[PDB]
Chains A and B, each alone.
Chain A
Amino acid sequence: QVQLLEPGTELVKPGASVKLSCRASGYSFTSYWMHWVKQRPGQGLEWIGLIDPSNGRTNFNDKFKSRATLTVDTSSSTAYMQLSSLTSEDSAVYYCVRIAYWGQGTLVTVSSASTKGPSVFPLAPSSKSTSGGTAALGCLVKDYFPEPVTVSWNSGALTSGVHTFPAVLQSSGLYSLSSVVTVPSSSLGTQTYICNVNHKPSNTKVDKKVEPKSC
């Protein structure tokens, strides 16, 4: 019955502002306080404040009081959280919350970075790979923004032994990710391995054959 609907994701530049919406349904909007909670990637939960939809009275956490505005549109059962003067520390999943129910959250990513397709580089089985009958090979998907990028191998024909790592934000503000697969070292001469990289946000599609090199 209780539904708390939030937007998917948002990319904002430093110093800019973001106005998150939280649409509620399933109960009496004004009868409940709406909380906003922040969660930085792999971080804990932090309460930002609440607003009483009935009167508009808000109560804040001092850290956000000076930059956050909590408003409500009772006509549309929507609470809004505008956070101003964003910096990278504001990149996080922001949830709206009412007693017992949590929204799915909106991932806000603050970056001065521009859209860019990944450079895909082969992580080749050389000799320093092969763990006996097991070689590791993969693709380094570098310098793309924003996330995400999907990587598959041999057009989905290869699923076993695949590890696509969570992306990391380089100091350049661009992401980088690696996808690796462990395969029988003896299959390197009878089987071709191709990582299929698709960065839909910049529609860059790339097929890189990862070929063994042994000087």
Chain B
Amino acid sequence: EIQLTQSPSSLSASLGERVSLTCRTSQEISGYLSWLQQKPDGTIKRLIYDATKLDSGAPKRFSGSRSGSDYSLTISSLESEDFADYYCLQYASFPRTFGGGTKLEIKRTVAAPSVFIFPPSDEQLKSGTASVVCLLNNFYPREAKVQWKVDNALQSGNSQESVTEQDSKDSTYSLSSTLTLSKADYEKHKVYACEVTHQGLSSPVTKSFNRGEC
């Protein structure tokens, strides 16, 4: 299959900034490449086709160009509507193939997360399961490492995390990590801690609570 290598996969930029996405083809595709935009709401729109032709419904700040096997999409001056996902699509050969995509997010200054930890409710414990929640609030950038330690033993594979979209007003993220344990296991342990590392934190932040206490 004809591979499309799209780079970068992720990009943080500010309004007014100029940005270029690129897709490299394994084999000659003769300009048969389109650039697609997928808004946050999921809808997909074609911006450029035949590598350089601007789609009628697309703003002029977008343009395509190709250098040999490199096809690029450039946004002259980023506006708020441009923060989205972008995919290049080739239609030179079959099967049709897409680049891996580029997620464009708003760049802002780093902001350490506010971390909160939540013991399981006695209400939940009555059901045989225990969920411990570690909350990372209003941070930037998105990258954050959360580890669960139960009586200082690193927990693995028993937690799941969720991250909200970048906030519309402050451009921050919030992350939730949930550690699930059987009621039995939960009661076999005392210290529950959630250790957070993030670029805005000069050192790991650990929030904990004791079961054999408050």
Contact = CB atoms under 8 A, between A and B. Distances in A.
Contacts of A9: none
A119 B44 contact: no
Interface in A107-124: 119, 121-124
Interface string B150-169: 00000000001111100000
Given A102-B44, A128-B118, A140-B133, A178 B162 contact: yes
A80 to B, nearest CB: 19
Interface in B42-79: 42-46, 49, 55
B118 A129 contact: yes
Interface string A42-68: 001111011000000001111000000
B135 interface: yes
Contacts of B121: 121-124, 140
A123 B87 contact: no
Given A123-B118, A126-B209, A166 B164 contact: yes
Interface in B104-143: 114, 116-121, 123-124, 127, 131, 133, 135, 137-138
Given A59-B94, A170-B180, A182 B114 contact: yes
B82 to A, nearest CB: 18
Contacts of A102: 36, 43-46
Interface string A118-139: 0101111011110100101010
A199 interface: no
B162 A121 contact: no
Interface in A149-206: 163-168, 170, 176-178, 180, 182
A156 B73 CA distance: 42
Contacts of A61: 1, 95-96
Given A62-B95, A124-B121, A163-B174, A44 B87 contact: yes
Interface centre among B94, B116, B119 (most CB of A within 10 A): B116
A21 to B, nearest CB: 18
Interface centre among A61, A123, A126, A168 (most CB of B within 10 A): A123
B137 A163 contact: yes
Could you tell me the dominant secondary structure of chain A's interface residues? strand
B162 A45 contact: no
Contact of A121 (B46, B123, B163, B214): B123
Given A47-B96, A131-B114, A215-B214, A121 B131 contact: yes
Interface in A75-109: 93, 95, 100-102, 104-105
Contacts of A100: 46, 49, 55
B23 to A, nearest CB: 12
Interface of A: 35, 44-47, 49-50, 59-62, 93, 95, 100-102, 104-105, 119, 121-124, 126-129, 131, 134, 136, 138, 140, 142, 163-168, 170, 176-178, 180, 182, 213-215
Given A123-B133, A134-B114, A138-B133, 10 more contacts: A47-B96, A59-B95, A95-B44, A100-B55, A119-B124, A123-B118, A126-B118, A142-B124, A164-B164, A176-B131
21 contacts: A44-B98, A45-B98, A47-B95, A102-B36, A119-B124, A123-B133, A124-B121, A128-B207, A136-B116, A140-B121, A163-B176, A165-B163, A166-B163, A168-B161, A168-B162, A170-B180, A178-B133, A178-B178, A180-B176, A215-B213, A215-B214
